[PDB]
Structure formats: C-alpha cells, structure tokens
Design a binder for this molecule. Structure first.
Ligand SMILES: COc1ncc(-c2cc(-c3ccnc(N4C[C@@H](C)O[C@@H](C)C4)c3)cc3c2CNC3=O)cc1NS(C)(=O)=O
Ligand SMILES: [Cl-]
Lengths: 950, 169
C-alpha cells in the first residue's frame, strides 16, 4: 500500500496516530500533524512547528534528529513508523554529522561505544580530533589551495608542438569565444588571451581558472595545455576543447557551502598460559577435542607448539591446563602473537576454529588476567597448517552464537610491566658491536645478496653492520634472518633500523607485507612511502588498503598515513572511502574499517554530502536490480524493460538516480537519466545498464552489477592501468581502455560503460555464412572510419591489440574469446570480464595468443604484409620488455593483494606465475628470445585454430 | 627402506581409475562444504541484522517509556487546575490518550518478542550448520590428501601429464 500509519509523540506527553503517504516529505507531515494536534488535548501548550524537530530510530538502531525536512519518509526509512517531537537547539551541527556518518559507513556509531574498549575509544578520540583539525585548517587557506584539494589535476604521464583551436566562454554568458592556441601553452596564456577577447581593463588573469565544462575538471598550474588529459584526449580525437572561465569568488562559493565543526628484562621465568574452558563448540560426539597453541611473530614460529590433552566432545569442554612454552617472558618481541586452534580428533584431523591474541596491548603493556577469545571458523585449504598466525587479531563479532576458548594469562609481577621504550632499545642495541675486518665474507655476502637458507642466515647476521653500509636495499633479507625469539638480537637489529637509510618506494612496498610485523619496520616503510606523489599513491591505494587487514592495533602509522593523504586530496579520499565501505559487511574488518571511515567523514564534510547522494543512488539500484531479477524469472525481457522504467519514473527513484557525481570518477557528472536508453544485460546476475546525459558537456553510462564479485576485475583493471602508465612513461601509447570498476558493497559495484563499442562476436554475427565469413571486423571498421580515417583505425587496433595481448599473457588471463573481447568505433581492441587470472579457471600456464582475425586486420587485409606485421611484433616486444624492467613492482603489489583473500591470488605459486611469465629469473636477452619463441608458436597456432573453426 | 604408502600397488590404469574416483568425490565434497559456507555466512549476516533490529526495538520502546514519564510528570499540573474549574471532560481526554499510548507499547513489545524467538531459532540453525560443516571437514581433508598421494604416485611412476589431466578433469 501507499500510505503508512505513523505514531506521533508530542512533548506534552500526548500521543497521536494517523496515516500519511510514504512519499510525503517531513515538512508536509509536520503540517498534517499540527492540523490534527489542534483537536487533541494540550495543543495550546505547544510552541510553533518550527520550534521542534522530528526524531526517530533509523535502520541502524540509533536516534536521529531529522534536520532536513525536505526528505521523504520512505527515504528517512525509520525502523518503525514512529516520530517524536523534540526541542530543536543543542549543538545541531555535531548531532547531524554523527547521524549521517552512521548511515553512510553502514555501521552505527553506538556499536563502537557498546564494545567498552579503550583502544577503540582512544582511536576515535585521537583520529576524529586529527581530521577535524585538518578540515578546519583546509577551510582557512586560499581558493587555489582548496581547488587543489577538491579537484586535483588530471595530467598524462609526460613533443608535438602543434596548433589547434579551442572554444572558451564565461560563467553565465551564453555566447562563446573560439580562438587559436598552440599545444605547449601554460593555462594563463589561454586565460589572458580569453580576457583580451572579453575586453576587445575589468579583471586580471590570476583570479581565474578554466573549467572543462560538463565535468569537474579544472585547468591550472605551471604545466602546459598538452599534458592535461582533456586536451590530450581532444587532440588525439581531433574534437575541439570546450572550457569555461570561472572567478576566484565563484570557487570560494563552493568552499563556503558549509563549515566543518569546531574542535622489563628482569622476568627470566618461561612464558605460560592457563587454558580454562571452551564454549559453544559444535562437533561430533565420537571424536574428542584438542587445542593446539603456538607463539608467532610474523609468519615464523617463536617456539615449539605445545598442545592440550584430549577432553571429550561437548558444547562446553573444560581443560583447566597450564601450557608452558619454550621461551621466556623477557625474550618476547613487541608483536608477539599467541595463536590457538581447536581441533576435533579420533582418540585411538578436523580443524574446528582458531583465534589469535597479541601478548602486549596497544599501550605497550604486557596483557595479564582472563580473556574470552571468540574464535573464527577454520576453512580447509591446500596447505592445511596447524595454526593460522596470518589471521586477524580482533575477535569474532558474533558473540551471540560463535565459539570461544576461555584462557587466562598469569600475573608475572606485582606492578604492571611494559615493553621497553626506544631509548632502552638503543641502549642495549648500540652495545655489542664487534668483528670488523673480514675480507673472505665480502664475496660470500655479495654472492648471497645478489640472489634464505640457515647456513647463509648466520653470515648475514654477523655482517649486519656491513649490510647497512654496502647492501642497504637488502633490509628485508636482514629483518628475516634476525632471530625475533631472542630480545638481544631484536635490540641490535632495531638499533640499525633507526639509522637505516631511506629506501626507494619499490623497496618500502615489500616491507608492508605480513612477514614484517614490527611497529618500527612499518614506520620505516611509511617514512619511505611519504615521498609518493598523489598520482603514484593512487596507483597503489587498493594494495595499501588491503595491508590494513594484517595490522595488529587500530591506531597505526599506515592508517594515519592514508587519512593524511585522503584529507589532502579529495580524489584519494573518495577512493579510500569506497575501498573501505565495500568491505564493511566482512566481520573481520568491519570495526577497523568502520572507525577509519568515521575519521575521514569528520574531516571531509564537503565530500560527505556527495557520498550520501551516491549511497542512495546505489540504494535504489539494488531495489531496481532486485525487481528486474525477480521479473526476468516470470516474464519475457521486452516487457521487463518497460516495467523497469515505470519503477524508474517514480519521485523517489528518478530524483535519487538523477544528479550526482559518478562513484567511478567523482569529477564526472551524472545528471539526467535517459530512461529510454536504460536497460539490463543478459547475464546470470542481470546487471543494470543506466545511461545518462548532460547539456553542459557528452553522454556517460554505468553498469550496476549485484551478485557476482568485482574485486578481481578491479585488480586486473588496476594492473592494465598501471601497465598503460609504465608504457606511456617510456613514450609508448598502446591505446588501452582500462575502464573503471568499483566495488561499492556486498557483491555489488559499478562498471564504466565504454561508449561506441560492441563485442567481436556481435560484429561478426552480421555477416554469417552458416557452414567467406571473414573480413567482418574489417568491414565494420570501414563504416565507422570512412576514407582516410581507416588507416588511423587500423593503427589503433594494432597498438591496442599488442598491449592487450601482452597484458593478458603476463597477468595469466585465460578464457579469451569473441564474446568477451570488444572493438571501439575508433578501432581499439579491448577486453572485458576478467573473471580469472594467474592461470586459474585448469591451473596450466596460459600461452601467448594471437588470433588470425586480429592478425588479418593488423596486416590491412593482405595475406602477407610483413612491414606492418613487424611493427606489431615490435609493439608486443617493447611492451613486454618494459614490464620486466618493473617486475618487482608487480610482484610486491601482488604480494600485498594476498591480504585480500582472493581465491586465485592466495599463495606463492600464484605470485610465482608472475615471476615466470615475466621471466624475472632470466636475463633481458634470454627473456626476450623466449618471448619470440612464444610469439612465433602463437602465430603457428593462429592458423590451426581457424582451420578447425567451421 | 619402508615408508607408509596409502596407495596399494596395482598398475597405472588401476591407480589412475582410483584418482578419477577420488577426485570426483573431492570436487563433490568441496561443492558440499562451499554450499554450507554460504549458509554459514548468510546466516551470520541475518543473525546480526536481527540482533540490531532487536536493539532498534529496545530504543523505540525506550522512547515510548520516556513519553510515559513525561505524560505522568506533565499531567500533574493540568489535572489539579482542571479538576477544580470544571474540566473533568479534558481530564478524561488526557487520560484516554495516555491509555492509547500504553496500549501501543504492548504491541511493540509483542513484535520485539517475536524477533527474539526468530533469533533463537536462527541461532539454532547457525550452530547446526557449523556442526554439519565440522563433520564434513575430515572427509574433505582426507579426500584431498588421498587425491594428492595418487597424483604423486603416478608422477613418480612416470605417467605423462596428458594422462593425469584426463583423470583430473
Ligand atoms: C565484471 O563483469 C563485467 N565486465 C564487463 C562487462 C561489460 C559488458 C559489455 C557488453 C558485453 C556484451 N554485450 C553487450 N551489449 C552490446 C550493447 C550494444 O548493448 C548491450 C545491452 C549488450 C555489452 C560492455 C561493457 C562492459 C563494461 N563496459 C562496457 O562497455 C559486463 C560485466 N558483467 S556481465 C554482464 O555479467 O558480463
Ligand atoms: Cl519491522
């Protein structure tokens, strides 16, 4: 039905109950309420409607003062239809933010309070303050600085010196000035020239900036016109640029829309623990339960893994055993990690669950007393380890129904004990430096460090002073040879780390991996990542986000670093937000990711408004896709398409989907839905195809896909993008189309629509013989590129095919076929739907693949055109060579993605795939002669595939 | 010298036939566990939804209980001044309005209680899933290790990769 019965609670105590329309805005409901209240008792005691604000309990179980009364009750979406009138005033700014954060981040802010955890309370206190400061500090500074934050420049990785005309206009005025300008002109030159056209006095050029009208992409700074993506895109296509001059004041109008709110080693007895009781264990009664425990630091064991006795299976098994480990209390490193696994065993091996605990807390204190560890279920995999030390440290959120081992860390001393401070570490670490002047071991270490085994480790440890001196890049090699189960060694290695020279970004990425848990290591890594430019940081933001999953404590350097950068650059904030938001459904990260999103939001109230509009658009798309999914099972597609529109016509649906910045690119503007062009694709999950339009620009499209997982397709597209940058940085544009792919939620996301494209299978389907049928792709490019433009179109195809051939080989992406490879009208081959990679699907190496159909187009229809075909061979060879030069970057990045828990990227073999495909074990000459053999054999195979095709 | 081999030595065809069988059984049990692990995760989401829906009922009820506090505290003034000065008719309206509020609370408590009963039943499901999952694990593991021992036996025996892939498919 349309109308809802709503409960109204008046501040006189009076209660009033009557139906109102779901679509009615809160201001309309308040009118209806006042009209009805007249005829109920104590009306004359009430103040005016404006004196009060509705309150309600929202979907996240929190009271919300509903300040914006231009909102429909169906969009407010209270838990029960119950509205309470309360006094308006009482710092309404902080109240309103706290409410919007809860709905935006998914989790309710009260769920942090409920935990009664100091670590959470200190994080929130420290980080929310830090973010509130930066945002306040941002609002103070100039419009240029603010423009840089809000709309950072989109440059190419960067010769032509050409001349081409450009349309320019001013804000408000309809008429436009087209005038000539060369490629290598700084933006001021265009602005000053555009002001002469205005005059031929009034204004000056340095109180202005050029907006690429249609979108939020601004043109400024010392860089020339040719390095901007828009102009570069306009020059390559041939189309004329279209800009708008905008005043400094008009930019301060955006800045001041809304304001941010105002402001010991004396304990030599062995480590031991009391295992008390299990709870809520589900297992087979014939078996008997065991609990295996072990201390860890990173991936390596600190000591032998002692176990329990076999107690009988039940819900509430009781051990009451002291477990003593072969390591002292004084030896434990800062990130020592006690790790449990409850097993079910035949008496005479089933892993039930597991749980890890940090022996020291977030305040550097050694934890004592009882702990109720709520456990995570064990999932079986190829390498079935006893314990799972790489697993998370925060407990299972499901305390209602989950299992739990009850244990008790004993009191070691009367007063509490901490891990020593950095001063006492450098005290012990500095001393015991010895054994200089050793010539024989300089050859031995160099031999070792130009490629670990136990013989080799002790040599590296002895010559640690010389490693710092001569082999600085081999820090990670040294960190692993360090024996973390002895506190003497740990002091000596940390002493060197404080003095260790700043490593390059590449080296510092390796140091973020799970093998290097120490706080001093991660701190050193970030210190080296702090020189990343925003462009380069963006290229790795996915990987840095995943690495948070194996951080020990909430407040860490990496988090502070990410928030630092997000507050300085709004685009980095945007993508940090969705990377976190799309994993808030995952119990193991919900708290960590929850608290960070709160911090970001408090320092990004501007963008917080934009992300709300996006969240609600995505909210409606789920509802729309779910109706389509259900309708497809019932009726035919044609009628479902018309029925989809009828839902899209509605007040709530049309306005929510209309007028919002794209999640895939917040500079891109989605304005008017083209409901005529809206549809859904034929695919298991039936993803929605939403087309937009813009009178300012210009026709953008998106795909809302819900049900399948997009994380792997994002990673793959991130890598093809990264490749494209690396290739562009060596002056090779291979015309790639790394379309945007963004996971927004639980098996939910957006995919960029590449305009003016179709699948190879569909292009070939027009000219069918039914058992020549070839030249279908080539015929198609004639119609979309007539006369002289075909030569360009063939070049776009050759260049693009080369990059996508190498890309798909290197990343190990199989299942490539006609109906998942696409051409553009420009003539650019590009690939879609990278469901599988690194050889997976069964697990064999994906060979290099040339298709005949594509070679035929490359050769311009001729059977033999070796001049043109050699060019293509060179494009492939040059491409592959460049990726090898940055092989370690790919390996390190993929090594961090192991955190993400993707099936196809889960282990060393999956990384080894990249090693072998890039031939990183071989020399550059040897690598490249192997690539030719692959190429040649793909060329021989190309014929044999299409001769079999009927 | 001796080593504990699970595979009894017949011949390449006999051993390869059992590799196909043990692999087919492994993939089928892997499907079974994965089917349950969805129901595990889905139920874990559904229980957590239910657990916060209970919290929202608590908070809504709280709001109703605050209204009752106000009404009783507020009515005190406009019942003495209404009892004298004639207006017992407004007293009757005031109080009947209050009785209509109290009556609404009972309904909200009733609906809270129904969800508590659902969460109790869905906690029973969750536990049973996990119990079923933990009974299937030892089979899934021993079928993995069996399958792998037969692969390694044939590789050692020198069987070509083409032949192994016929069986593993
Ligand atoms: C991660 O998973 C996906 N990755 C990429 C895409 C995808 C698919 C196609 C495509 C494929 C086949 N046919 C057509 N039509 C031609 C057009 C004229 O009209 C349409 C109604 C049908 C279009 C185009 C694009 C993309 C991404 N950007 C595009 O531009 C889809 C999925 N999801 S799926 C559906 O499950 O494969
Ligand atoms: Cl409900």
């Amino acid at each position: 039905n349309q109308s809802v019965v709503v409960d109204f609670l008046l501040p006189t105590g009076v209660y009033l109950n009557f139906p109102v329309s779901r679509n009615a805005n809160l201001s309309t409901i308040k009118q209806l309420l006042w009209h009805r209240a007249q005829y109920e008792p104590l009306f004359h005691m009430l103040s005016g409607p404006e004196a009060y604000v509705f309150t309600c309990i929202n979907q996240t179980a929190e009271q919300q003062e509903l300040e914006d009364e231009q909102r429909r009750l169906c969009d407010v979406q209270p838990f029960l239809p119950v509205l309470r009138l309360v006094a308006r005033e009482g710092d309404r700014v902080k109240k309103l933010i706290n409410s919007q954060i809860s709905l935006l981040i998914g989790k309710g802010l009260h769920e942090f309070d409920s935990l009664c955890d100091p670590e959470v309370n200190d994080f929130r206190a420290k980080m929310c303050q830090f973010c509130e400061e930066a945002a306040a500090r941002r609002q103070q500074l100039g419009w240029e600085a603010w423009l840089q934050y809000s709309f950072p420049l989109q440059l190419e990785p960067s010769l032509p010196n050409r001349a081409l005309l450009v349309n320019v206009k001013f804000e408000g005025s309809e008429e436009s000035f087209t005038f000539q300008v060369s490629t290598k002109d700084v933006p001021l030159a265009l602005m000053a020239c555009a002001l002469r056209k205005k005059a031929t006095l009034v204004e000056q050029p340095e109180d202005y900036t050029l907006q690429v009208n249609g979108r939020h992409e601004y043109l400024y700074g010392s860089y020339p016109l040719c390095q901007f993506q828009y102009i570069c895109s306009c020059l390559h296509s041939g189309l004329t640029p279209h800009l708008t001059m905008v005043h400094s004041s008009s930019i301060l109008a955006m800045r001041d829309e809304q304001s941010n709110p105002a402001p010991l080693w004396s304990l030599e007895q062995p480590f031991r623990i009391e295992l008390i009781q299990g709870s809520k264990v589900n297992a087979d009664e014939r078996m008997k339960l065991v609990v295996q425990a072990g201390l860890f630091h990173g991936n390596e064991m600190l000591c032998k893994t002692v176990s329990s006795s076999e107690v009988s299976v039940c819900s509430e098994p009781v051990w009451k055993q002291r477990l003593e480990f072969d390591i002292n209390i004084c030896d434990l490193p800062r990130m020592a990690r006690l790790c449990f696994a409850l097993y079910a065993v035949i008496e005479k091996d089933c892993p039930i669950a597991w749980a890890n605990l940090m022996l020291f807390d977030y305040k550097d204190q050694l934890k004592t007393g009882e702990r109720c560890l709520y456990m995570w279920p064990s999932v079986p995999d190829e390498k079935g380890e006893l314990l799972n030390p790489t697993g998370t440290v925060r407990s299972n959120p499901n305390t209602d129904s989950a299992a739990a081992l009850l244990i008790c860390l004993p009191e070691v001393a009367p007063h509490p004990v901490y891990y020593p401070a950095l001063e006492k570490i450098l005290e012990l670490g500095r001393h015991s430096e010895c054994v200089h002047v050793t010539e024989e071991e300089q050859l031995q270490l160099r031999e070792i460090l130009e490629r670990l085994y136990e013989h080799e480790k002790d040599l590296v440890w002895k010559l640690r002073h010389e490693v710092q001196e001569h082999f600085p890049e081999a820090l990670a090699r040294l960190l692993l040879v360090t024996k973390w189960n002895k506190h003497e060694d740990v002091a000596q290695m940390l002493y060197l780390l404080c003095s260790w020279p700043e490593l390059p970004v590449l080296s510092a990425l390796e140091l973020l991996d799970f093998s290097f848990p120490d706080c001093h290591v991660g701190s050193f890594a970030i210190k080296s990542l702090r020189k990343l430019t925003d462009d380069e940081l963006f290229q790795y933001l996915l990987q840095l986000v995943q690495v948070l999953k194996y951080e020990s404590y909430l407040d860490c350097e990496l988090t502070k670093f990410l928030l630092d950068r997000a507050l300085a650059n709004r685009k980095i904030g945007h993508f940090l937000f969705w990377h976190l938001r799309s994993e808030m459904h995952v119990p193991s990260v919900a708290l960590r990711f929850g608290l960070i999103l709160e911090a970001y939001c408090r320092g990004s109230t501007h963008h917080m408004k934009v992300l709300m509009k996006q969240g609600e658009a995505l909210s409606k798309l789920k509802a729309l896709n779910d109706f389509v999914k259900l309708s497809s099972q019932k009726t035919p597609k044609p009628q479902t398409k018309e029925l989809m529109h009828l839902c899209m016509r509605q007040e709530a649906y049309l306005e929510a989907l209309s007028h919002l910045q794209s999640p895939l690119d917040p500079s891109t503007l989605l304005a008017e839905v083209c409901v005529e062009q809206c549809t859904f694709m034929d695919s298991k999950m039936k993803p929605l195809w939403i087309m937009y339009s813009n009178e300012e620009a210009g026709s953008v499209g998106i795909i809302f896909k819900n049900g399948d997982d997009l994380r792997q397709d994002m990673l793959t597209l991130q890598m093809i993008q990264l490749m494209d940058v690396l290739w562009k940085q060596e002056g090779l544009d291979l015309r790639m189309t790394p379309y945007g792919c963004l996971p927004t939620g639980d098996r939910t996301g957006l995919i960029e629509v590449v305009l003016r494209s179709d699948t190879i299978a569909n292009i070939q389907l027009n000219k069918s013989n039914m058992a020549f049928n070839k030249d279908a792709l080539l015929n198609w490019l004639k119609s979309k590129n007539p006369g002289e433009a075909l030569d360009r179109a063939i070049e776009e195809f050759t260049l693009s095919c080369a990059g996508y051939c190498v890309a798909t080989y290197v990343l190990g992406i199989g299942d490539r076929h006609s109906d998942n490879i696409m051409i553009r009208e420009s003539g650019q081959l590009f690939h879609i739907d990278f469901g599988h990679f690194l050889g997976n699907f069964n697990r064999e190496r994906v060979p290099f693949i040339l298709t005949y159909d594509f070679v035929h187009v490359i050769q311009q229809g001729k059977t033999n055109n070796s001049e043109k075909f050699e060019r293509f061979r060179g494009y492939c060879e040059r491409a592959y060579t460049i990726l090898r030069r940055h092989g370690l970057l790919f390996l390190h990045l993929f090594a961090l993605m192991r955190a993400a828990g993707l099936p196809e990227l889960s282990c060393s073999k999956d990384i080894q795939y990249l090693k072998d495909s890039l031939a990183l074990g071989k020399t550059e000459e040897e690598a490249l002669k192997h690539f030719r053999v692959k190429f040649n054999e793909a060329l021989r195979e190309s014929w044999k595939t299409k001769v079999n095709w009927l | 010298y001796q080593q504990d081999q699970v595979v009894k030595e017949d011949n390449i065809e006999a051993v390869g036939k059992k590799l196909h069988e043990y692999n087919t059984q492994f993939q089928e049990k892997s499907r079974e566990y994965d089917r349950l692990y969805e129901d595990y995760t889905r139920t874990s989401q559904e229980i957590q939804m239910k657990r916060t829906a209970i919290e929202a009922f608590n908070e809504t009820i709280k709001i109703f209980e605050e209204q009752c506090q106000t009404q009783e505290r507020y009515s005190k003034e406009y019942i003495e001044k209404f009892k004298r000065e004639g207006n017992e008719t407004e007293i009757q309206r005031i109080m009947h309005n209050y009785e209509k509020l109290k009556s609404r609370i009972s309904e909200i408590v009733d609906s809270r209680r129904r969800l508590e009963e659902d969460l109790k039943k869905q906690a029973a499901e969750y536990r049973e899933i996990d119990k079923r999952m933990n009974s299937i694990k030892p089979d899934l593991i021993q079928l993995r290790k069996t399958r792998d021992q037969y692969l390694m036996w044939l590789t050692q025996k020198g069987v070509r990769q083409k032949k192994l892939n016929e069986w593993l498919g």
